[PDB]
Amino acid sequence: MHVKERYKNFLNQHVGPDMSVQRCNSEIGPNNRKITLSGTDNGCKPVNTFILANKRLIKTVCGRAGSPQGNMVRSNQPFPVVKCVLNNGERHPYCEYRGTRSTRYIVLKCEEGWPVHYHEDEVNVG
C-alpha cells in the first residue's frame, strides 16, 4: 500500500477549498485535475465530489473528528461539498457534469490517519 501516494491522489480528486458547481467541468478536465474513470486513461468518472475545506481540517476526520462506518469513517461534523455528476460525454476533454452544492457528513477511507478515498453516493448518470 502506498498511503502517501493515495493521500495525494485524494487531495487531487476531492479537496477543493474554493470549488463551486460552475467549476465542475473545468476542474475535472485535463487543463486542471484531469480526474479520470478508474481503469481508463481518458474516461469520465460518473460522480466526483469536492470537499470545500482545507486538507488539514479534512484529515481530522481520520482522527478525533470522525467515527467508524464499516470499513470507512464518517465525519462528526458536516462539510460543504460540490457533487459533480456526469451528464454527457464519454471521454476527456468533454466530460460534462451537473453540480450540486450541499452540506454533508462525509464518509472516507482512512489509513493511519490519512484520508485515501471518498465514498460517493450511487448516481444515475447521463
Side-chain angles (χ1 to χ4, degrees), residues 13-15 47-51 81-84 118 120-121:
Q13 292 193 129
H14 299 299
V15 178
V47 55
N48 189 84
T49 294
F50 289 97
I51 298 162
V81 301
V82 166
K83 176 177 172 188
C84 299
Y118 189 94
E120 308 280 1
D121 293 324

Side-chain angles (χ1 to χ4, degrees), residues 62-113:
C62 289
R64 178 185 186 276
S67 303
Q69 184 175 302
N71 69 334
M72 308 271 176
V73 166
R74 180 175 63 252
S75 66
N76 294 343
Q77 284 73 53
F79 280 67
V81 301
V82 166
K83 176 177 172 188
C84 299
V85 181
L86 182 66
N87 183 274
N88 64 81
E90 56 290 278
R91 59 176 189 75
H92 284 304
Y94 302 127
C95 297
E96 315 297 343
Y97 292 82
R98 170 171 314 168
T100 50
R101 178 71 163 81
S102 81
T103 311
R104 299 288 300 276
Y105 285 97
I106 60 173
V107 176
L108 309 183
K109 186 163 291 123
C110 295
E111 296 287 348
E112 296 184 340

Side-chain angles (χ1 to χ4, degrees), residues 10-11 16 33-34 38 40 42 44 55 59 67 70-71 116:
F10 169 89
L11 292 185
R33 310 161 179 252
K34 207 162 186 180
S38 198
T40 72
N42 74 328
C44 306
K55 57 184 186 206
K59 179 186 185 309
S67 303
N71 69 334
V116 298

